[PDB]
Design an enzyme around this catalytic site. Sequence first.
Site, mmCIF file in Angstrom:
data_model
loop_
_atom_site.group_PDB
_atom_site.id
_atom_site.type_symbol
_atom_site.label_atom_id
_atom_site.label_comp_id
_atom_site.label_asym_id
_atom_site.label_seq_id
_atom_site.Cartn_x
_atom_site.Cartn_y
_atom_site.Cartn_z
ATOM 1 N N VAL A 60 3.659 0.939 2.635
ATOM 2 C CA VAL A 60 3.708 -0.278 3.386
ATOM 3 C C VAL A 60 4.216 -1.352 2.443
ATOM 4 C CG1 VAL A 60 2.402 -1.901 4.732
ATOM 5 C CG2 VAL A 60 1.753 0.544 4.681
ATOM 6 N N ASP A 93 -10.316 8.486 10.101
ATOM 7 C CA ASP A 93 -10.053 8.173 8.686
ATOM 8 C C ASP A 93 -10.429 6.765 8.336
ATOM 9 O OD1 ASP A 93 -9.250 8.851 6.106
ATOM 10 O OD2 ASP A 93 -7.188 8.408 6.488
ATOM 11 N N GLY A 131 3.970 7.691 2.900
ATOM 12 C CA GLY A 131 5.040 6.760 2.512
ATOM 13 C C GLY A 131 4.443 5.489 1.921
ATOM 14 N N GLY A 168 0.844 -1.175 0.000
ATOM 15 C CA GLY A 168 0.000 0.000 0.000
ATOM 16 C C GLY A 168 0.874 1.217 0.000
ATOM 17 N N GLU A 169 0.232 2.365 -0.180
ATOM 18 C CA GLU A 169 0.924 3.612 -0.477
ATOM 19 C C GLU A 169 0.028 4.779 -0.119
ATOM 20 O OE1 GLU A 169 2.559 3.600 -4.504
ATOM 21 O OE2 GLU A 169 4.489 3.460 -3.460
HETATM 22 N N1 JQW Z 1 -1.077 -6.173 4.512
HETATM 23 C C1 JQW Z 1 -0.914 -5.517 5.622
HETATM 24 N N2 JQW Z 1 -0.621 -6.219 6.703
HETATM 25 C C2 JQW Z 1 -0.449 -5.518 7.905
HETATM 26 C C3 JQW Z 1 -0.568 -4.151 7.919
HETATM 27 C C4 JQW Z 1 -0.871 -3.459 6.748
HETATM 28 C C5 JQW Z 1 -1.040 -2.088 6.757
HETATM 29 C C6 JQW Z 1 -0.963 -1.314 7.866
HETATM 30 N N3 JQW Z 1 -1.221 -0.053 7.539
HETATM 31 C C7 JQW Z 1 -1.470 -0.033 6.244
HETATM 32 C C8 JQW Z 1 -1.768 1.045 5.529
HETATM 33 CL CL1 JQW Z 1 -1.881 2.772 6.384
HETATM 34 C C9 JQW Z 1 -1.969 0.837 4.165
HETATM 35 CL CL2 JQW Z 1 -2.340 2.162 3.275
HETATM 36 C C10 JQW Z 1 -1.883 -0.453 3.573
HETATM 37 C C11 JQW Z 1 -1.584 -1.534 4.405
HETATM 38 C C12 JQW Z 1 -1.378 -1.298 5.723
HETATM 39 N N4 JQW Z 1 -1.046 -4.188 5.643
#
Ligand code: JQW
Length: 330
Positions: A24, A137, A22, A17-18
Amino acid sequence: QSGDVLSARYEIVDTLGEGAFGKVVECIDHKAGGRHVAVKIVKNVDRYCEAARSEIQVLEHLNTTDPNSTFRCVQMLEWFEHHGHICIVFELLGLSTYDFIKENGFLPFRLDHIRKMAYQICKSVNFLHSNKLTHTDLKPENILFVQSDYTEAYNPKIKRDERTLINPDIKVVDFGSATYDDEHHSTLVSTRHYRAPEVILALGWSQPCDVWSIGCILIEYYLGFTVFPTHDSKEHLAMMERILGPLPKHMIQKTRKRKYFHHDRLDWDEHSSAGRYVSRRCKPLKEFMLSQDVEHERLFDLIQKMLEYDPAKRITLREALKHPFFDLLK
Ligand SMILES: Nc1nccc(-c2c[nH]c3c(Cl)c(Cl)ccc23)n1
């Protein structure tokens, strides 16, 4: 940065993710037998550093109160710094609810799965609310499946294949904006389509803004699309009025967003181009219902209570958790 190594053990192997903050990333943990974790790497920029520190404090609080994640908040495993980026390591989850829907062609979730997810989301966020926190959020991108494994079968109704999750359990992630009762409250919170009207009108906010966000989320899970397809504040309010009725007068008199109003009414021409767009895309809430059976009327009864305009009148998540919609889980 794929191939980089953090704190000498975590090898980046993918982007999960993004965001503003920043990214992930999925990493291999070379010190724990190669099994995989998630790592959030925050930009080396003040406002994102501070959010990250705040997130860490909230996660330590939550993880100490609920070490087993009974209340479905994401588990932080450790944190550290690396080239002046704050890095937070989490248990690895599966796809976000948003990504699962998109991957399925914007086919909505079945009602049985929606009941289970909604419950877990309300249980999670109510835990926050019980501990003097507001998330601020909430959105489908921030609700992730524990495992996103699915079965597949032809559905003759739609004439195509569809994916059904084996296990629909979720966790809530992203506590970067989460705000304690006694802390500074940002002027503008939430991502626009999940943003409550008190926020739009700058009347101040608290826990009830999360409830509005949840209401918006559940509609999206049910339809596969937003009912607020907008990127303009005044329009977003016209859409609210079309779906929910007129804004309460007291809210209108209190706001200083006077640009949105003429006399004590939304300054909105239904016959303009934007007016036609709203009238086309938006309609009274209950008209989005896909069936009239009682399960559907109850989901819609909850939604409507979460989308009460006056945050003082809106349903609380403690009250939501006892709503009839949830009994088929008993
Ligand atoms: N797959 C996975 N496993 C554990 C945590 C996360 C995770 C924690 N915070 C995140 C945010 Cl802010 C975004 Cl935008 C995308 C994924 C995560 N993702």
